[PDB]
Design a protein around this ligand. Structure first.
Ligand code: CA
Ligand code: CA
Ligand code: CA
Ligand code: CA
Lengths: 28, 148
């Protein structure tokens, strides 16, 4: 839940940024 | 400047293919509201349009590659929050049992469109499971995400 940005968008931004982190860039 | 490194941007390029159903490089209010509610919410079209207008260049109701990246590039490039770990956990695990195993993880990856291997998911979990019990908890996740 952003402050003054895009909920769905930013929501996706964080979700993707999180999974991708565990998808590959995890134990790099 | 307005962009991210090959790593940070990596999630953006991929993310774009997650938002758009056809992955044509642009997401419209039609797909936005669809995938948005798909997660676990019931927002309105109003948010889709307004939010999008805040990201689109021409403001036609759809965001572009540089438009989505540039917006999120000008600020906040690399960072995380205790919320991202909780929300993430909810995005990874469907039933959200507070514990995800490589198996369930593999099922998730392939469930969204990713072919993960037993050794891959097993190594991905054990590497994120500080307690090594076959799953991943909150703290285990929050740390494995940023506070490694
Ligand atoms: Ca499209
Ligand atoms: Ca546009
Ligand atoms: Ca589960
Ligand atoms: Ca554990």
């Amino acid at each position: 839940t952003p402050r003054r940005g895009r909920g769905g968008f930013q929501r996706i931004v964080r979700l993707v940024g999180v999974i991708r982190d565990w998808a590959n860039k995890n134990f790099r | 400047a307005d962009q991210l490194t090959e790593e940070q941007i990596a999630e953006f390029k991929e993310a774009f293919s997650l938002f758009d159903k056809d992955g044509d490089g642009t997401i419209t209010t039609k797909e936005l509201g669809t995938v948005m509610r798909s997660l676990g919410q019931n927002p309105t079209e109003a948010e889709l349009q307004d939010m999008i207008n805040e990201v689109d260049a021409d403001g036609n109701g759809t965001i572009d590659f540089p438009e989505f990246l540039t917006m999120m590039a000008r600020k906040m490039k690399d960072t995380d929050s205790e919320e991202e770990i909780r929300e993430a956990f909810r995005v990874f695990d469907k039933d959200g049992n507070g514990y995800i195993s490589a198996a369930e993880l593999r099922h998730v990856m392939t469930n969204l469109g990713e072919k993960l291997t037993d050794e891959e998911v097993d190594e991905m979990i054990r590497e994120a499971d500080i307690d090594g019990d076959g799953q991943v908890n909150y703290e285990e996740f929050v740390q494995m995400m940023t506070a490694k």
